[PDB]
Structure 1
């Protein structure tokens, strides 16, 4: 349970790595709804999630185990698949970052 969270820090560190930056950047920080003019985001997405928030919750020991950490990572991608049209570029970027996550998470 607790032994798994040090692997979670390594996964998140890998997701913030420069080799993933071309597709990972939209997930580093919360969606800036004001800068993008997305007035309905908070009405559709009840639980916003991004990599910086997950890092804060992980350092605050808010995840009991890897499953709790993985649920927030998957909430981040699901928020993206739910809010956006399926053909939007951010959805293709979310799929590439999710492959990086799923690979390290399974291993």
Structure 2
């Protein structure tokens, strides 16, 4: 069922926003501030930005047909982070930690 799928998707995102994962999930909470220092080239490299607050709104506006569509946006958020940042950056390690949480939950549904 697509409706049951989307309720599980809202549940997965709720855990990603939870205090349990807050120490490594916080840079993905809100859109990347492109006006901040060191982020002047962010829009040149990242054509499709995504964050957890935009995903939360997209679920609430019913912009996802199914779990795969929600999954594609979550992975876009992680891929943007791996594409923009150097492999040794602190935020890359945090993206991997949060992706481990998402992937385990997304697979077991």
- Shorter-chain TM-score bucket reads over 0.9
Matches of 2:38 and 2:107, distance apart in 1: 37
* Structure 1 residue runs of 4 or more that deviate by more than 6 Å after TM superposition: none
- Structure 1 gap segments, 5+ residues each: none
**How many residues matched?**
107
Matches of 2:37 and 2:9, distance apart in 1: 31
Higher helix share: 1
CA contact under 8 A between 1:2 and 1:64: conserved in structure 2? no
Q: Does 1:105 align with 2:93?
A: no
Q: Provide the alpha-carbon RMSD of the alignment.
A: 0.8
TM-score, normalised to structure 1's length? 0.97
TM-score, normalised to structure 2's length? 0.95
Render the CA deviation track for 1:67-87: whole Å, top value 9, x for unaligned: 000000000000000000000
- Structure 2 gap segments, 5+ residues each: none
